[PDB]
């Protein structure tokens, strides 16, 4: 038997996994990072929007702080987030940016002087004072009033990922790629590591550790149309689910992007619309103004996606051999503007769409983009399975709830990497594990037997046909608009698809470097993940954040102010087990209310919310009257935890 | 219609004792805006699931899909079948990297080795307090560093380099660029002499024969030609 | 052998534990010797082409290089020292540049294959540099030794003699293209290698250097063929069996 | 480029998945070309030394190599083809053997240091092989081209002319030691490399081959100096300014 | 902490250790042989008398 030991095992080489590995390796814990691919090729590398952090350096960022970022995050989540977690996040995001700047990330800097900027309310000029020169800049992204999205020109995710990966190399972290975790090793409710398949050699290996962290990204590829890399299939989610102990949170909470290029899904940054881009229909008609006379194309991202689909259903969509879509017109912004501020989007349309955005329109359609759902953890990042931690998009730390803020996800990856990293490090250094070879052998032999069964299967089902049908079902029934009747149909077909996945037969019999065998074991995992998403959507009879039920259009704070917890205790069951974790209003700093975007009064008010709100107003008044600062007030409303290393305040330009 | 494309692919499995290197041809009907990414996945799902290749972002941002396309190392996800007036496309794995199987090679581990070799990280005596204001940097400088930080470690300039093909220890264009990327970063305290201890030898900057194929194939259009010359002038002046 | 060289050979570093500066020096000298020969050849093509202006013309120049304004009829021995000097640089350059040739079957096979697959201009031009360089080991040495040992045989009549009667034209014809292609490409790569003229628009500078390279080659090749024909024509007119053409030009002013 | 060469370059093996047989062929040809030149030179030293037996002697041999028993006064053009042939082998050999030179600073430094520390005879002799080989790139080419293009100038009188009047003796003097040391050591190593004569007592065979090598070199060097002096002496006696020595031997029987 | 696992750990690379390692490795057990020195330099190499066996 092949066994590898390390003190800290990290599954996933994206921003979250690598940053967590820095956290453990720096304190002397031997850590291994496993990844399907070279770590610098992780999906994190594709982020071009930027990272949200309340620095308050620039003119449009002036006055920004933790409280404002916090409020944007909670209201954005439609109150589905754990507010204590959101607080931990907002207070640490500024330090994440500054640490990265220290590690060489080339953040775009502010230069003194006037600037030609778009505000879309007063597209006047912006002036940056001399005392702001040379500090980290920020732009308008995510719909926040205060511009706090930091960026390194047009490749933010790229530079961030490279810096963190390089720090891992500096520290001697063992980076092992083309390695896939296919099962978690657990006994007595504790996680002792993972069974790993070497993608090159086919070897099945047991990686044991005192602590294991899953930072495997999102599960967007269960959808046919997605902005996600082809490796974002949620197998990390599935292995946690298959332990029968760890639970998945809000899997039905999936966020879509309104303007990905159709049908590839290659992202066309929000900057297109933010700069003045226009959405048109089959007749070239600018339609957003018809639905949003006020906000128009500058409406909430959430609203734009919905209107686009509505317009398509009204029969104004553009017919295509790949389906219906709409048009994005940025040629109206001028050729000069596109070749200086949108030079990237120009290359994308030319390289893949074979068009020049300065002359022709780009085909677009809303598509799956971010996975709010994930492995459920406490505030420390630990799952119900002891010793198993999760961070990044793969987790449901839940600072996002039912709608993540644009710019908050790459921010969370590094921030969670830092925070969960510390707690993870503490767990690995303080816990003592009992590694029974009987258990290791059971799990390893169990997967070797499984690979053999797949290679010898005389089944007649085609793995790709099954996978493709799964993706169509998800797109057609679990998209922007959902309803009970279609969701019931989806759950039934997915369950049928799952059962047939077991009768798959493959042509290539080799155990090494076999992409067909890979699909043979990944698809069944994806189907179980899809079932959690679909079933979760079916049972959640309300409309919250990104989850919109046409048959239940209102947010229900009375019966649904909770979080969906999915599990798969019995390996025989063909549907996921769903339970619910209630959100205690008494522990909220901001009581449930209007989210800001969408129709007003579109939520069933909960009496407990009113009580808490009053209680909050009272506490604020008294404390604010006694000349108490925002910090002491925050503490009195909702105290939260933070590792000692990050409990310091964030200095700002103006203290 | 859509004209029939003839796809010729290099196939070889070094881990199989019975495999022999050979080309296999596939007939694919072209579609609008069809890329090699689409072509290879079509072949995988409907004609030959044996074929190995690596794609991730399919957007030209991750550097995973480099391969020889009609003799030139290029990103397959960003290569259009339309640009080949002839209809015949030949695919080979990138040379100068360890072959895994067919079109799949190990670029990632060679790059991690290079990153370690040139100490690809900020070298500084003191850690700036992360709870305080960041150290100010001129915007133009940040822009210059970013320009060189754009490398996506795709390996195209490594495989395009005749020098590297013949002499495997050559650090490569990506390695020389990486050195410059830190040289011009104010956060890094290394001096020219420190850099000389890293690449001031025949497997380093002096091993470059200025073939410039690296410059001409870089999908991110980095200024390799001028930056390598810049480094050469600095290293030859040490001592 | 010295203690220091032993320590470097066995440790891989100098006694001060630093990497040797020799690779830098060798790189410098390779380019320096290359630059010298490249420029030398340009001037060489002009002075040797004076035959096109008339026998009296080149004859006048030939005497200047022999220090006419310092010696009676000019001492041809001056050309001998100049020849020996260039010969030395020629040898040093070959010695240093030879380090860059593909050196085994594997290197040769993989590079040649790569060159053919790539169809990359600058890569192919390097192969030409290497090929022409190897050829000049044999072609250049013959000419250099003769110029160094028979300087009194240089002139409108004498040079034409060697060109035709001594059958030196086949060597000159090949060497002309060999040294011109090698030299022009060499000067071009030298510019992009050290980037002396990069400036603010490197790609534009390189584009122009490439154009310049092609023209320089064209002009010099044609001028070389013209000059070549002149020497041949005259050499083909020397039919009198009672005339000592070899030392004719010398037998005019000692 | 061919499909097979591409497959070999990218896979490291032939289409049949075997290692290329080219390295074996190249090794064979390197030794074969070496053997040819080595033996050629021994015969060369004897035929060129006939000047010691008298002008009429070598003159007689010179005419035989020009096919006297087939043509009137013998056509010197025969020597041209022979020269071109040897030149070709000379070039092919240099091309193949050049693969063995130390090729970078590190290799040169470490081998030179090793040679000086070891004081091992056969190792030091290889360095001599390499040095003399490199030198002959320049020295051998000059002579080969001349013999190939001016065969009608070979003889007791004409050869002595070139030796002295055309200042070819300095080149011949160096080349004599260069080619003899290179050739004798080369033939010796060839024998121990392929072990054609090992037999039952290999160490004894090698001991004798080493002795033979030294004697062969001694005999040929001395004989070479004697022959050298003969050509010089005669060349130093050609003082009449009205005699065409260069083509004198030719002007006897067309 | 640095930890290395194998099914069969053999301390000593002489005739006894190496032969035992053959016994375990042949049946698929991952085995490691630790030695102060390259195994072929073990004292076993000095035996010149011979090996007793009733052939
Ligand atoms: C898709 C996308 C997302 C995105 C964005 C643009 C695009 C095209 N732009 C953003 C932006 O401007 N601002 C922002 O805040 N977020 C943006 N996002 C989303 C964001 O980039 C992601 O949420 C974030 O990068 C996620 O980071 P994370 O570290 O969590 O995950 P990852 O980078 O995807 O990496 C996952 C790693 O896991 C390995 N893996 C996966 N499964 C396995 C198994 N089974 N075994 C072993 N390793 C596994 C992957 O290989 C990878 O390294
Ligand atoms: C000394 C001697 C013995 C000997 C002999 C001649 C000499 C000079 N001639 C013999 C003969 O003709 N016939 C015969 O039957 N026996 C003869 N012997 C004795 C015989 O050779 C020995 O008894 C036999 O070879 C012992 O074999 P064994 O496999 O037991 O041991 P070894 O070869 O000495 O190797 C010991 C290995 O252990 C490693 N080592 C030791 N300590 C450590 C620690 N702490 N950690 C890790 N490795 C360790 C050594 O490195 C070695 O490999
Ligand atoms: C008068 C004749 C010659 C001229 C004008 C000349 C000129 C040049 C020039 C300008 C360079 C550029 C050097 C550099 O890039 O640093 C060059 C390169 C080179 N030369 Fe020559 N050269 C001559 C003869 C030779 C000979 C006889 C050899 C034989 C070994 C040779 C082999 C090379 C090679 C292989 C290179 C490429 C070096 C590299 O890639 O670094 N040259 N030469
Ligand atoms: C200082 C040394 C040199 C001197 C004095 C010199 C002199 C001359 C002279 C006088 C000629 C005319 C024909 C003759 O007299 O045989 C000639 C021709 C020629 N030389 Fe040189 N040369 C020198 C070095 C070189 C070098 C290094 C090369 C290149 C390896 C070279 C290449 C040529 C060529 C190709 C021609 C033919 C010109 C034509 O036909 O266009 N020379 N040289
Ligand atoms: C008429 C002149 C020459 C003669 C008589 C000659 C003869 C020989 C002989 C007998 C060998 C043995 C070959 C073997 O071991 O397979 C040898 C080796 C060698 N020769 Fe020459 N050679 C001549 C010119 C040259 C030239 C111009 C070069 C220039 C590159 C050269 C470079 C070498 C080298 C470096 C070796 C050693 C090869 C090895 O170690 O494998 N030779 N030669
Ligand atoms: C088939 C080609 C060859 C022919 C016909 C030939 C002919 C001659 C002749 C006639 C001489 C007398 C002087 C003169 O006429 O200039 C001579 C001398 C000489 N040759 Fe050759 N040779 C040939 C090849 C070689 C080669 C390949 C080498 C070595 C690289 C060589 C080395 C010498 C030396 C060193 C002398 C001086 C003899 C002495 O002074 O002892 N020859 N050769
Ligand atoms: C062009 C000048 C070359 C520069 C000198 C240094 C590099 C070349 C010598 C070192 C490598 C040895 O080179 C080896 O030569 C033999 C020629 O006999 C080549 O042989 C191959 O090409 C030659 C020439 O096109 C063909 O006639 C032959 O059939 C083919 O098999 C080997 O593929 C090559 O690897
Ligand atoms: C003897 C013939 C050589 C065969 C040709 C192939 C091997 C040699 C060339 C390739 C290696 C480059 O060779 C490099 O040359 C320079 C000379 O300028 C040497 O330089 C060293 O030796 C030379 C000569 O004794 C000294 O004057 C010099 O001060 C010293 O530093 C380098 O130590 C050597 O490594
Ligand atoms: O438009 C983009 O660049 C990113 C959007 C997001 O992260 O939501
Ligand atoms: S320098 Fe260009 S070609 Fe080379 S690895 Fe980087 S991005 Fe790819
Ligand atoms: S192609 Fe290679 S030789 Fe130098 S110029 Fe680029 S790294
Ligand atoms: S798949 Fe990422 S660059 Fe091609
Ligand atoms: Na998530």
For A253-306, the DSSP string reads: -EEEES-BBTTT--B--THHHHHT-EEE-TT--B-HHHH-TTTGGGS-HHHHHH
Domain of residue A619 covers: 555-648
Instruction: Output the six-digit token pair for A642.
Output: 């933070």
> Is A257 assigned a catalytic role?
yes
Closest CA to A112 of A50, A55, A53, A57: A57
User: How remote is the CA of residue A165 from the centroid of ligand 13, in Å?
Assistant: 22
Strands of the A8-11 sheet, one edge to the other: A174-176, A31-34, A8-11, A211-214, A388-390
A380: CB partners within 8 A, 6+ apart: A389, A420, A423
- We report the CATH number of the domain holding residue A489 as 1.20.58.100
Q: What is the number of alpha carbons within 13 Å of residue B32 lying toward its C-beta?
A: 9
Is E9 labelled as part of a ligand binding site?
A: no
Q: Residue A179 in contact with residue A199, Cβ under 8 Å? A: yes
Contact A52, B73 (CB under 8 A): no
**Which residue from B110, B122, B213 is spatially nearest to B170, judged by alpha carbons?**
B110
* Method used to determine the 3D structure: X-ray
Residue nearest to atom 30 of ligand 4 (CA): C140
Question: Helices (DSSP H) in chain C: which residue ranges?
Answer: 3-11, 22-48, 55-64, 77-97, 105-118, 121-149, 158-164, 169-194, 202-235
Residue C82 phi/psi, 5-degree rounding, is -65, -40
Reported structure resolution in angstroms? 1.8
Distance CA(B85)–CA(B116), nearest Å, equals 42
Report, in this order, helix, strand and coil percent for chain A, each rounded to 5. Answer: 40, 20, 40
Mind telling me how many Å the CA of C206 is from chain D's nearest CA? 29
| Judgement on whether residues A18 and A139 belong to the same structural domain of the protein | yes
Instruction: Please indicate, yes or no, if residue A618 is contained in any of the structural domains.
Output: yes
In a domain, A8, yes or no: yes
By the CB < 8 Å criterion, does B229 face chain C? yes
Question: Is the C-alpha dihedral spanning A319, A323, A324, A330 positive or negative?
Answer: negative
Token pair listed for C110: 């993989």
Q: How far does the centroid of ligand 3 lie from the alpha carbon of residue C147, in Å?
A: 21
Contacts 24+ apart (CB under 8 A), A338-341: A341/A271, A341/A275
End-to-end CA distance of chain C: 50
SS3 A195: strand
- Whole-angstrom CA distances from C239 to A220, A501, C233, C234, C245 are 91, 96, 12, 10, 10
Provide the token pair at D156: 């007791």
Place of tokens 């620039």: A58
**Residue C139 with chain D: CB contacts under 8 Å:** 141
Evaluate whether chains C and B are touching (3 or more beta carbon pairs less than 8 Å apart).
yes
Cα→Cα distances A9→A172, A177, A210, A376, A643, Å? 14, 13, 8, 19, 21
Q: Which residues of A are annotated as a binding site for FAD?
A: 13-16, 42-44, 49-50, 235, 393, 409-410
Q: Facing residues of A580 across strands?
A: A564
A622 and A492 fall within a common domain: no
Residue A444, domain member (yes or no): yes
- Residue A111 burial class via C-beta count within 10 angstroms: exposed 0-12, middle 13-18, buried 19 and up: middle
According to DSSP, residue D37 is labeled: H
Coil, helix or strand at residue C206: helix
**Count of alpha carbons within 13 Å of D223, Cβ hemisphere only?**
18
Do chain D and chain A touch with ≥3 beta carbon pairs under 8 Å? no
Is D120 annotated for ligand binding? no
Distance B234 CA to ligand 8 centre (A): 23
User: Which ligand number lies closest to the CA of residue B218?
Assistant: 10
State the number of CA atoms in the 13 A half-sphere of A261 facing the CB.
Answer: 22
Q: Are residues A162 and A131 in the same domain?
A: yes
**Phi and psi, residue D150, nearest 5°:** -130, 50
Please check whether residue D215 is in contact with residue D208, taking contact to mean a CB–CB distance below 8 angstroms. no
Whether A371 and A351 map to the same domain: the answer is no
After which residues is the backbone of chain B broken at C–N > 2.5 Å?
Answer: none
In a domain, A545, yes or no: yes
Q: Which stretch of DSSP H or E encloses residue A440? A: helix A437-456
Catalytic residue among A69, A186, A257, A563: A257
**B65 close to ligand 10 (CB < 6 Angstrom):** no
Please indicate, yes or no, whether residues A279 and A386 belong to a single structural domain of this protein: no
CB A391 within 8 A of CB A417: yes
Check the CA dihedral C26-C27-C29-C30 and report its sign: positive
In this structure, what DSSP letter does residue B133 have? P
Give the C-alpha separation, A24 to A430, whole Å: 12
CB B220 within 8 A of CB B152: yes
State the Cα angle at A354 between A353 and A358, rounded to 5°: 90
Of residues A45, A103, A133, nearest to B61 (C-beta): A45
Q: Which two tokens stand for residue C6?
A: 């032993």
Give bridge partners of residue A186 from the DSSP assignment. Answer: A191
User: What is the residue-wise DSSP string for E1-55?
Assistant: ---B--SEEEE--SHHHHHHHHHHHTTT--EEEE-SS-GGGSGGGG--S------
What is the Cα–Cα distance from A507 to A18, expressed in whole angstroms? 36
- A308 touches A366 (CB < 8 A): yes
Q: Does B205 touch chain A (CB under 8 A)?
A: no
- Cβ proximity of A24 and A422 under 8 Å: no
Residue in this structure with the two tokens 């003769």, named with its chain if needed: C146
Nearest CA to D158 out of D226, D49, D244, D82 is that of D244
Residue C136: CB within 6 Å of ligand 3? yes
Cα-based distances in Å from D144 to C139, D141, D164, D247 = 11, 5, 18, 19
What is the rounded CA–CA span in Å between residue A400 and residue A86? 8
**Is the torsion defined by CA of C211, C216, C221, C223 positive or negative?**
positive
Alpha carbon of residue C244 to chain centroid: 30
Let me know: does A82 contact A398? Beta carbons within 8 Å: yes
Q: What is the distance between the alpha carbons of residues A286 and E3, in angstroms, rounded to a whole number?
A: 65
CATH 3.10.20.30 location in chain B: 1-106
Q: Which of A521, A554, A587 is the last residue of a domain?
A: A554
Residue reference for tokens 């912006």:
A126
Of the residues C37, C79, C143, C173, which should be mutated to test ligand 4's pocket, given the most ligand atoms within 8 Å of the CB?
C143
- The active-site residue, picked from A19, A186, A273, A325, is A273
Residue B152 sits at φ, ψ, to 5 deg, of -105, 15
CA distances A350 to A46, A327, A594, B86, Å, are: 18, 16, 42, 22
DSSP sequence for B25-79: EEEEE--TT-BHHHHHHHHHHHT-TT-----SSSSSSS---EEEETTEEEEGGG-
Cα end-to-end distance, chain B, whole Å: 67
Return the residue matching tokens 């707690």. Answer: A423
Retrieve residue A15's tokens: 């921003």
Q: Are C254 and C169 in contact (CB under 8 A)?
A: no
- Indicate the pairing of strand A603-604 with strand A555-556: parallel
Note if the bond before A263 is cis, omega within 30 degrees. Answer: yes
Residues of E within 8 A of A7 (CB-CB) are: 1
Please tell me whether residues A331 and A410 are part of one structural domain.
Answer: no
Neighbours of A148 (CB within 10 A): 32
Ligand 2 centroid to E14 CA: how many Å? 6
Ligand that comes closest to the CA of residue B61: 12
In a domain, A197, yes or no: yes
Rounded to 5 degrees, φ, ψ at C63 are -70, -30
- A500 within domain boundaries: yes
Host H or E run for residue A150: strand A149-150
Q: Which ligand is nearest to the CA of B217?
A: 10
- Dihedral angle at the C-alpha atoms of C180, C181, C182, C183, nearest 10 degrees? 50
What are the structural domains, with CATH classification, of chain C?
1-254 (1.20.1300.10)
Question: Residue written as tokens 């293009």?
Answer: D149
Atom of ligand 5 nearest to the CA of D190: 15
Tokens 């070549």 appear where?
A: C228
Contact, A385 vs A186, CB < 8 A? yes
C203 contact residues in B (CB cutoff 8 A): 225
Rounded Cα gap, residues A265 and A366, in angstroms: 9
Whether A213 and A287 map to the same domain: the answer is no
Residues A164, A152: one domain?
yes
Kind plus residue range of the DSSP H or E element containing A233: none
Q: Return the structure tokens found at B222.
A: 């980095």
Contact D167 C146 (CB under 8 A): no
Tally C–D CB contacts below 8 A.
92
Q: Is the CB of E36 under 6 A from ligand 2?
A: yes
- Give a yes or no: residue A268 inside a domain: yes
Tokens 């107003």, located at residue: A617
Residue linked to tokens 């596109």: A338
Rounded to whole angstroms, how far apart are CA atoms D64 and D75? 10
Q: Do B225 and C202 touch (CB under 8 A)?
A: yes
Residue D130 CA to ligand 8 centre (angstroms): 13
B53-B54-B55 Cα angle (round to 5): 125
- State the helix-helix crossing angle for B139-149 and B172-183, rounded to 10 degrees: 160
CB–CB contact C134 D95 (8 Å):
yes
Burial class (CB in 10 A: 0-12, 13-18, 19+), A582: exposed
- Give the Cα separation of A348 and D8 in Å (integer): 37
Q: Do chains E and C touch (3 or more CB pairs under 8 A)?
A: no
Superfamily of domain B1-106 in CATH is Beta-grasp domain (3.10.20.30)
Domain covering B107-125+137-239, topology: Fumarate Reductase Iron-sulfur Protein; Chain B, domain 2 (1.10.1060)
Based on the structure, what is the number of domains in chain A? 4
**Count of B-C CB contacts under 8 Å:** 92
Closest CA to A255 of A297, A300, A315: A300
Please state, in angstroms and rounded to a whole number, the distance separating the CA atoms of residues B70 and C7.
Answer: 49
Q: What is the 3-state secondary structure (H, E, C) of D142-167?
A: HHHHHHHHCHHHCCCCHHHHHHHCCC
Q: Measured between CA atoms, how close is D215 to chain C, in angstroms?
A: 30
- All residues at 6 or more sequence positions from C44 whose CB lies less than 8 Å from its CB, including other chains: none
Contact A197, A449 (CB under 8 A): no
- Positive or negative torsion for Cα A141, A142, A143, A147: negative
Please check whether residues A348 and A388 belong to one and the same domain.
no
- CA A92 centroid distance within chain: 18
Strands A562-567 and A577-582: what pairing? antiparallel
The neighbours of chain A, by the rule of 3 or more Cβ pairs under 8 Å, are B, E
- Of ligand 8's atoms, which has the minimum distance to the CA of residue D108? 35
HSE, side-chain direction, 13 A CA sphere, residue B197 = 10
Same domain, A207 and A236: yes
For residue D98, the CA-to-ligand 5 centroid distance in Å is: 8
At which residue do the structure tokens 């013209």 appear?
C226
Which H or E element spans position A617?
helix A607-625
User: Which tokens belong to D247?
Assistant: 């083509």
On whether any CB of chain C is under 8 Å from the CB of B140, the answer is no
| Residue from the list A134, A649, A650 with its beta carbon closest to the beta carbon of B136 | A134
Cα A251 from Cα A241, distance rounded (Å): 12
CA–CA–CA angle D98, D150, D83 (5° rounding): 40
* Chain A residue numbers touching B136 (CB-CB < 8 A): 109, 133-135
Q: Which of A522, A537, A531 is nearest to A568 (CA)?
A: A531
Tokens 């013999």 belong to residue: D147
Residue of C nearest to B212 (CA): C122
- Assess contact for C38 and C146: CB atoms under 8 A: no
Q: Would you call D241 exposed, middle or buried from its count of C-beta atoms within 10 A (0-12, 13-18, 19+)? A: exposed
Token pair recorded at residue C107: 């290197």
Return d(Cα C229, Cα C235) in angstroms, integer. Answer: 10
User: CA dist D92 to C241, D12, D41, D176, Å?
Assistant: 39, 26, 16, 21
What is the rounded CA–CA span in Å between residue B35 and residue B69?
Answer: 12
Boundary (domain end) residue, out of A413, A436, A459: A436
User: A434: exposed, middle or buried (C-beta count within 10 Å: 0-12, 13-18, 19+)?
Assistant: exposed
Are the C-beta atoms of residues D193 and D168 closer than 8 Å to each other? no
β-partners of residue B69 are B72, B91
Compute φ and ψ for A103, nearest 5 degrees.
Answer: -85, 10
Residue to probe by mutation, ligand 5, list D25, D34, D143, most atoms within 8 Å of CB: D34
Domain membership of residue A413 (yes or no) is yes
User: What's A29's domain CATH number?
Assistant: 3.50.50.60
Q: Do A202 and A316 lie in a common domain?
A: no
The domain boundary, picked from A349, A365, A381, lies at: A365
**Which alpha helices (H) appear in chain B, and where do they start and end?**
36-46, 108-117, 139-149, 156-159, 162-166, 172-183, 192-199, 213-217, 224-235
Alpha helices in chain D (DSSP H): 3-11, 22-48, 55-64, 77-97, 105-118, 121-149, 158-164, 169-194, 202-235
* Ligand 3 atom closest to C185 (CA): 10
Q: In a 3-state reduction of DSSP, which class is residue D236?
A: coil
D95 CB within 8 Å of a chain C CB: yes
Whole-angstrom distance, CA of residue B125 vs CA of residue B122? 10
D142 close to C (CB below 8 A) = yes
Asked whether the beta carbons of C153 and C250 are under 8 A apart, the reply is: yes
Decide if B202 touches C, using CB distance below 8 A.
Answer: yes
Query: What's the rounded Cα separation, in Å, for the pair B22 and D6?
Result: 10
Strands A362-364 and A577-582: unpaired
* C5 closest CB neighbour out of D6, D109, D244: D109
Phi-psi region at B210: left, alpha or beta (left = phi > 0; alpha = psi -120 to 50): left
D82 shares contact with chain B (CB less than 8 Å): no
- Are the C-beta atoms of B64 and B55 separated by less than 8 Å? yes
Give the C-alpha separation, A179 to A176, whole Å.
7
């Amino acid at each position: 038997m092949k066994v590898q030991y390390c003190d800290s095992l990290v599954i996933g080489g994206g921003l979250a996994g690598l940053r967590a590995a820095v956290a453990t390796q720096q304190k002397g814990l031997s850590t291994i990072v496993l990844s399907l691919i070279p770590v610098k090729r992780s999906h994190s590398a594709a982020a071009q929007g930027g990272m949200q952090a309340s620095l308050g350096n620039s003119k449009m960022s002036d006055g920004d702080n933790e409280d404002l970022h916090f409020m944007d995050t909670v209201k954005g989540s439609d109150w589905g987030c754990d507010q204590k977690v959101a607080r931990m996040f907002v207070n640490t995001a500024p330090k994440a940016i500054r640490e990265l700047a220290a590690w060489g990330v080339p953040w775009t800097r502010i230069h003194k002087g006037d600037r030609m900027a778009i505000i879309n309310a007063q597209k006047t000029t912006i002036t940056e004072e001399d005392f702001r020169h040379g500090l980290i800049h920020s732009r308008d992204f995510g719909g926040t009033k205060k511009w706090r999205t930091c960026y390194t020109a047009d490749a933010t995710g790229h530079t961030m990922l490279f810096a963190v990966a390089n720090e891992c190399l500096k520290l001697g972290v063992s980076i092992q790629d083309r390695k896939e975790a296919i099962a978690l090793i657990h006994q007595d409710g504790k996680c002792y590591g993972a069974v790993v398949r070497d993608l090159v050699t086919g070897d099945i290996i047991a990686y044991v550790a005192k602590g294991t962290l899953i930072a495997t990204g999102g599960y967007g590829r269960i959808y046919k149309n997605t902005t996600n890399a082809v490796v974002c299939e949620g197998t990390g989610t599935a292995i946690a689910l298959e332990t029968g102990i760890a639970q998945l949170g809000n899997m039905e909470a999936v966020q879509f992007h309104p303007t990905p290029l159709f049908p590839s899904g290659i992202l066309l940054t929000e900057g297109c619309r933010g700069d003045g881009g226009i959405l048109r229909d089959v007749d070239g008609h600018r339609f957003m103004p018809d639905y949003e006379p006020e906000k128009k194309e500058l409406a909430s991202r959430d609203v734009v996606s919905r209107r686009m689909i509505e317009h398509i259903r009204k029969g104004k969509g553009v017919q295509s051999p790949y389906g219906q879509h709409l048009w994005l017109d940025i040629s109206i912004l001028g050729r000069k503007h596109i070749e200086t501020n949108l030079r990237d989007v120009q290359e994308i349309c030319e390289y893949f769409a074979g068009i020049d955005p300065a002359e022709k329109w780009a085909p677009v359609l809303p598509m799956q983009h971010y996975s709010m759902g994930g492995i459920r953890t406490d505030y420390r990042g630990e799952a119900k399975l002891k010793g198993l931690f999760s961070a990044g998009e793969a987790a449901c730390w839940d600072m996002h709830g039912f709608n993540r803020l644009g710019g908050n996800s790459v921010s969370e990856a590094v921030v969670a990497g830092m925070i969960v990293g510390e707690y993870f490090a503490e767990h690995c250094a303080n816990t003592q594990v009992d590694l029974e070879t009987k258990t290791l052998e059971k799990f390893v032999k169990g997967q070797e037997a499984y690979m053999k069964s797949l290679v010898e299967s005389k089944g007649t089902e085609d793995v790709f046909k099954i996978k493709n049908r799964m993706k169509d079902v998800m797109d057609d029934n679990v998209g922007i608009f959902r309803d009970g009747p279609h969701l019931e149909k989806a759950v039934k077909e997915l369950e049928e698809l799952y059962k047939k996945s077991k009768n798959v037969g493959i042509k290539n019999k080799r155990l090494h470097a076999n992409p067909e065998l890979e699909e043979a074991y990944r698809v069944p995992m994806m189907l179980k993940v899809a079932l959690c998403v679909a079933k979760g959507a079916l049972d959640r009879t309300e409309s919250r954040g990104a989850h919109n039920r046409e048959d239940y259009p209102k947010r229900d704070d009375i019966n649904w102010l909770n979080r969906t917890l999915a599990s798969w205790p019995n390996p025989e069951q063909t549907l996921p087990t769903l339970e619910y974790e209630a959100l205690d209003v008494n522990e909220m700093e901001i009581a449930p209310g209007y989210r800001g975007y969408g129709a007003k009064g579109n939520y069933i008010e909960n009496p407990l919310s009113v009580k808490r709100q009053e209680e909050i107003d009272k506490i604020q008044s008294e404390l604010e009257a006694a000349g108490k600062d925002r910090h002491a007030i925050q503490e009195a409303l909702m105290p939260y935890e933070l590792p000692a290393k990050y409990k310091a305040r964030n200095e700002r330009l103006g203290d | 219609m859509g004209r029939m494309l003839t796809i010729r692919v290099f196939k070889y499995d070094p881990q199989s004792a019975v495999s022999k290197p050979h080309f296999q041809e596939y007939k694919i009907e072209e579609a609008p805006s069809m890329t090699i990414f689409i072509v290879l996945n079509m072949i995988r799902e409907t004609y030959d699931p044996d074929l190995n290749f690596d794609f991730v972002c399919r957007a030209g941002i991750c550097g995973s899909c480099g391969m020889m396309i009609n003799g030139r190392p290029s990103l397959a996800c960003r290569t259009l079948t339309k640009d080949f007036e002839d209809g015949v496309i030949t695919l080979l794995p990138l040379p100068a990297f360890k072959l895994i199987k067919d079109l799949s090679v190990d670029t990632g581990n060679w790059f991690n080795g290079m990153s370690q070799r040139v100490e690809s990280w900020i070298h500084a005596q003191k850690e700036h307090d992360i709870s305080k204001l960041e150290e100010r940097i001129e915007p133009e400088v940040a822009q210059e560093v970013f320009e060189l930080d754009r490398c996506i470690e795709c390996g195209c300039c490594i495989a395009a380099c005749g020098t590297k093909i013949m002499r495997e220890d050559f650090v490569g264009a990506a390695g020389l660029n990486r050195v410059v990327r830190f040289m011009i970063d104010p956060h890094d305290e290394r001096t020219d002499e420190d850099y000389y201890e890293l690449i001031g030898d025949d497997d380093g900057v002096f091993g470059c024969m200025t073939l410039l194929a690296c410059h001409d194939v870089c999908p991110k259009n980095l200024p390799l030609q001028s930056k390598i010359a810049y480094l050469r002038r600095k290293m030859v002046s040490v001592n | 052998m010295t203690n220091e060289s032993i320590l470097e050979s066995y440790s891989g570093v100098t006694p001060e534990r630093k990497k040797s500066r020799m690779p830098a020096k060798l790189d410098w000298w390779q380019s320096a010797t290359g630059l010298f020969l490249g420029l030398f050849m340009i001037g060489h093509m002009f002075f040797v082409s004076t035959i096109l202006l008339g026998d009296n013309v080149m004859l006048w120049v030939t005497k200047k290089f022999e220090l006419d304004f310092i010696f009676e009829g000019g001492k041809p021995i001056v050309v001998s020292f100049l020849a020996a000097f260039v010969f030395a640089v020629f040898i040093a350059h070959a010695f240093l540049a030879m380090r860059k040739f593909p050196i085994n079957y594997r290197q040769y096979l993989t590079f040649k294959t790569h060159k053919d697959l790539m169809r990359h201009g600058d890569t192919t031009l390097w192969w030409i540099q290497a090929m022409t360089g190897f050829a000049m080991f044999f072609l250049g040495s013959v000419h250099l030794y003769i110029m160094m040992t028979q300087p009194q045989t240089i002139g409108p009549v004498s040079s034409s003699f060697r060109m035709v009667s001594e059958w030196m034209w086949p060597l000159y014809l090949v060497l002309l293209f060999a040294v011109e292609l090698h030299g022009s490409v060499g000067l071009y790569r030298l510019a992009v290698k050290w980037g002396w003229f990069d400036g603010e628009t490197p790609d534009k500078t390189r584009a122009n250097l490439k154009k310049l390279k092609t023209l320089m080659s064209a002009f010099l090749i044609v001028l070389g063929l013209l000059t070549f024909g002149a020497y041949v024509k005259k050499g083909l007119e020397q039919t009198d069996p009672n005339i000592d053409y070899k030392y004719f030009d010398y037998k005019r002013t000692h």
